[PDB]
Design goal:
6 copies of one chain form a homohexamer. With 223 residues, chain A is of the alpha/beta class. Chain A is built from 6 helices and 10 strands. In chain A, strands 5-9-8-6-10 form a 5-stranded mixed β-barrel, surrounded by 4 helices. In chain A, helix 2 packs parallel to helix 5. Chains in contact: A-B, A-F, B-C, C-D, D-E, E-F. Chains A and B meet through strand 6, strand 7, helix 3, strand 8 and helix 4 of A and strand 6, strand 7, helix 3, strand 8 and helix 4 of B. Chain E: Keywords: Glycosyltransferase, Transferase. Chain E: One of its GO terms (cellular component) is cytosol.
Chain lengths: 223, 222, 231, 221, 222, 237
C-alpha cells in the first residue's frame, strides 16, 4: 500500500498525511484554514499546485488538502488518500447555491446523500441506479455539533453537477425532488468512500441563493 | 386534502389514519403488531387485502398498514398516505438478505440510502441520477434506539430490486459498492417521501445470507 | 420442481395448483370468481392474503389467484407458477384505463402486446429492446370467444406502467402510438412466460376512460372469455 | 399533393390498398411475373421497382424496400401516409434462433424485438413493444394451417447489422428468428393506424419462398 | 480475403473492385459519374439492384457503386468492401439538408465528424460515447481541392439520422451541426474499426430553416 | 466577449487582459514553465484557485497560457468563460496522454481530430442523439503541417476523454482505433462548437498502455513536452 506513494498527483510519502483530511476546492482556503487553526503546520504536497498540510488542532493530528473543481478532480485525490495513504475520514467543505427556498445565506448544509450527473458509476459496472450517501457516523456528529454551536443547518440531499453554467433550465426537477443545494464534487467522494469502506462527508455553506468560518469549526470538531 | 379520501386502494376516511404509519409487506405480520403492541385497535382498511389499523402505543396514536410486494405497490400506498391522509412519517419494517458478509442473522439494517432498479423515477423527469435517502432525524432516532436497546445494527446503503429471483447473478457489483442488504420497496418510499417533504425510514431484519426486536425499535420512533 | 413447493409467497404444495391459472390483482375479485364459476373449490394459499383456489369449470380443473399490484408483484407469482408448480397457462384478468377514444367503459381489451416501464428486463441482460407479446394461441382463442359471445372487444397493444398517479402527463405519446389501454402487470408476465416457454395472456375490462370527461358486474363478461380458455 | 416522392415515382392511385414487400428487387419482379395478371410498373426510382397487378381478382402491388429499418421506414411511411395503403405484408428470408425450426419453415412475426430505430423520434417515455396487426396474423396462421405448411408464430428480432456474440439473451427469450426490418414497419403502421405483417422463410440456422408467397397473397383485400 | 467473395449482397469477384470506392445512394448518380469521368468502364455488381462500376480516372483505378438508404444499408456494403475486397478508401458523395443558416444551396459540406442516431455502435460494446470521425488525410485533401478549384465548402460536423420524416433539429442546430443525411456515421465506424479510410461529402439540396462535388471527390483517387 | 462578467469567480482577469489565443494545460507548473521559456512581456492575470494565467508575446503575436485543472468539469468552467466572457477565439489544449495505439512511442504527438468520452455535460445541451466531439479543422490542419514541417513524429485521429484516472475497459476503445486516453478534450470541443469558436487538443505520449508499460523518465515529463509546445505556439494568431 505504502509502495504506491508518492503518486503522480501527490508528492507526500506514506504516513505524511493524517487519518482525517479536510478538503476544499480552493488552495487559498486550504492554505488559510491551516494557518488559522493548526499548529506545527507542515506542507506535504505542492504537485499540480494542489497544496496539502498536516498539523495539530486540539491534540489530534489533522491534514488539509485542495481538490480542485469537479467530480473527476476530487475523484483522483480521494482515491489516492483512501487507497494509498491510509486515510480513514474525509470531510469536504465548500460553498453552494440553494435550491431549497427556505435556506438563508450562510446556512450550513449537510450532505446526507448526493444526486449527480454521470461521472464514475460506469467504471463500477453497476446494474442499476446507485445512491451516493455519506457516512452516517460523520453525518450525525456534524448535526450534533451544528445544533450545539447553535448554527442554522439543514440535513439532506444535494446535487453534484458537471456544469457551472447551465445551457437551458434544469434546476426544476431537483427542486421538486427536494434537493437542498448544488455543488460539483460530493457524489464522487461518496462513491469512492463506499468502495473503500471509508468515511466521507460533504458540508456546504450557502453562497448564492437560487430562488463561512463557522462551517470550518463544525468540520474541525469532526477530527 | 380530505376531499380525495377514500381512494380506490384505501377505504379509510380522512383523519382515521394517524400521522405515523408503520408499514410491512405481509398483512398477517401487520395484524400481529396490532394485536400485540396496540390498544383500542380499529380497522380502517380492508380493500384489496392490505389491512390497516389505528390504535395506541404508550399514549401516542399510531397506525399500522400492509404494502404488498414491490416498488409500484408500496408506491401507491405511500403516495396516498403522504398526499391525501396527512401522514408525516412512514417507518417501513421487513426482512432482507444480506450482501455485507460481516452481518449476522437477526441483525437490524438501517436504510440510510437506497439503490434501485428503474421504477417511476422517469415519472419525475429527473435530468440525472437521483439518490434515494431516508429522513435523517428518523435514522438517528433508530440508531439511538439500537445503541440504547443493545442490538447489533448496521446503518447505510440498501438495494430495492424488482426481482426476487435473479437470472444469472447481479449481486456482485452491489457487494463491491458496500450495499448492506437487498429488499424490494425502500427506494420508492424514500423517493415519494422526498417529493412530499415527508418522513420515511426503512429498517430491515436479516433473514437470509447471500424479528420482534426490530418492531420495538420502530415503535420507539412514533 | 416439487422440491421448491411451498414457496415464501405460496403455501400450496406441488400439484395443488392447476395447469391453467387465472389471476387478478384484487384478492376479493378472486374469491368471487371462485364462488361464482368453480365447483369442488379448495383454497391452496393464504400467505400474504394472496388467496388461491383450485376448482372445476364445465369439467375442466383450474386455479384462480391474486397477484397484488405492480410488475414485481406478478413477477414473483408468475415465476413460481411457471417454474415450480408446473403451470402451463396464465390468464390475467383485470381493469384498465382507456387510451383509445373509441373504447367504451365495459369494453374488453386483449393485449397481443405490452409496452412497459422498466421492470426486470435488465436482469435478463437483453442487448437491445425487447417486445413483450402474449401467446398467439391464447390470444386467438380469446378473440374467437368474444366474437362468438358478441362482446365488444379490441385486440392490440397495452401499456404496463409502474405508476398509478401520474406526476404530470406522459399518456400523450402512448396514445399517438396506438396503445389501447393502461394497466400495471402485463409486461412482466409476458416476459416471464417467454423465458419459460409457457403461455400468458392479459385481458382487460375498461373501467376508466383516460380522455374526455373521464367517466369512471361488468367484469363478468371478461371472466367468461378467460374461463373458456382453460385447458 | 404529395405524390410522387423523392424515393417513389408513382402518383396517387397507382398503388393498390395491399402492398407486399421484399428486400430483393428480383423476388419482387418474380412475384409479379409468377402470380399477378395485368402487371404495370409504377416506380423505377432508386431502382426500387414497384408493380401493380391482380391476384385472383383483387388489386395488389409488390415492391422492393432495400436493406435495414431506416430503408423500409421510408417506403412504409410514404405508402401509408401519401398513397392510402391499408395493408403492408413483408416477406423475407431470415436466420433461425429457435433450435426446433428447420429450414424452409414459415415464421410469422407477431412481435418484433429491435435495435434502436426511430423510436427516439416518437418521444416514447418507456419501452415500446412492436406488434403485428392481429388480423393479418390470424389470417396467415389460418392460411398456413389450411395449406399444411410448417410455421411458427412469435417474436422476431430486427437487427441493425448483418455481420456480428449478441444473440444468447435473444435465444434465451424465445425469439424465433433474426432479420433487419420488421420493427420499424410495425411502429409506422401502428402510428398510422394501419395494418402490417412480417413473415419469413428460414434460409439459415444460427446454431421455398413460394409457400410463403402463397400465405402472403391470401392476405390481399 | 478470397473465400468470402462474392457475398450475399455484392456479386463481384475479388480484384474486380478498385482500392478506392466512391459511393452514392441514388444508383442514377453512380452510373452518371462513371459515364462522365471514367475510362474503360466495366460493371461488376448487379445484385440487390446495387450497380457497381470500375474504370479509370486520370490513370488510376477507381470504382463507383450504390449503397441504398440508411446506416444499416451502407453498413453492409462498406463492411464487405473493406473486409473482403481489400478496399482502402471509401468516399461517400450525397445530398443533404442544411442546419447551418449560412450554408447556401449547392455548397459542399465535408464531414469531418458525424453525429448519429443509434446504429450498431451497440455491436462494438463501447463503454462510453463514441465520436465518429472521418479520416484526416482524405478530409484535408478534399479541402485543398475545394480551394484549388474555388468551390464553396464548409468542414465540420454532420448528423446521420435514422428517419427521413420527423422537430428534433433545434439542439443539433445549437451544436453547430452543418447538415443532416442518413449514412455517414456508420461508414466512419466501420472504416475506423477496420483501420481503413472514409469520408462523406454532401451537396446542400435543402435548407431546414452535384458535379462540382464529384471533382473534389475524384481528386481523392489514389 | 461580455465585459460585464469579468472577472469571474474562477478567473481574476479583467476583460482584455486575456489574449485571443489561449493555450491550456492541467498543471500550473507546466504553464509557468511555458511562459518563462517562450513568452516575453509576460503579465500574470489570474491566480484564483492556483489556476495561474499569463499573457505575453511569442514571435510578435500576443497569446495567453493558463492552468485548467483535472477533468472535464474543470476545463468546462475555464473554456466556457474564455469563449463567452473573455472574447477568446482559439483554445489549444496541450497535455500528456497514455497510448492505446501500439505503434505510438513515448514522445509522439497525438492530434485529437475527435474525442470519445464518458458523460460530461452533453445532457445539459439536451441533445436527442449521440454527439461526436470534433476539433476545429483549420487548427487541426495547422498542427499537422507544423509537425510534418518540423519533422516531429505525430498521429492524428481519435482520442478518449475519460472521467477516471484509476480504472479493464480500455479494450473496446482500442478495437475502435482510439489513439490515446486523457481527461479533458471532449468538454472543450463541446463548448467550442456551441460557442462557434476554435478548439484543438494536442498530446504527448508519456505512458504506454500496452506492452511492459514503459513510462517517461522523471525528466521528460517536465522536459520532453517541448516539441508539442512549439507546434501549439505556432498556431497562435
Amino acid at each position: 500500500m505504502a509502495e504506491h506513494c508518492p503518486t503522480p498527483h501527490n508528492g507526500a510519502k506514506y504516513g505524511e498525511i493524517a487519518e482525517t483530511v479536510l478538503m476544499a476546492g480552493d488552495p487559498l482556503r486550504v492554505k488559510l484554514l491551516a494557518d488559522t487553526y493548526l499548529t506545527d503546520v507542515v506542507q506535504y504536497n505542492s504537485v499540480r499546485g494542489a497544496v496539502g498540510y498536516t498539523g495539530y488542532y486540539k491534540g489530534v493530528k489533522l491534514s488539509v488538502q485542495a481538490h480542485g473543481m469537479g467530480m473527476p478532480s476530487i475523484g483522483i485525490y480521494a482515491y489516492e488518500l483512501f487507497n494509498f495513504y491510509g486515510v480513514k475520514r474525509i470531510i469536504r467543505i465548500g460553498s453552494a447555491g440553494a435550491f431549497d427556498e427556505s435556506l438563508k445565506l450562510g446556512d450550513i448544509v449537510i450532505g446526507m446523500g448526493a444526486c449527480y450527473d454521470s461521472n464514475f458509476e460506469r467504471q463500477y459496472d453497476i446494474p442499476g441506479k446507485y445512491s451516493c450517501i455519506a457516512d452516517f457516523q460523520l453525518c450525525r456528529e456534524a448535526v450534533d455539533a451544528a445544533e450545539k454551536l447553535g448554527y442554522r443547518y439543514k440535513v439532506g440531499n444535494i446535487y453534484s453537477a458537471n456544469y457551472f453554467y447551465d445551457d437551458g433550465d434544469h434546476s426544476g426537477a431537483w427542486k421538486k425532488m427536494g434537493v437542498l443545494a448544488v455543488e460539483m464534487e460530493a457524489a464522487a467522494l461518496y462513491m469512492i468512500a463506499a468502495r473503500a469502506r471509508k468515511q466521507a462527508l460533504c458540508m456546504l455553506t450557502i453562497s448564492d441563493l437560487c430562488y463561512f468560518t463557522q462551517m470550518m469549526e463544525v468540520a474541525l470538531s469532526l477530527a
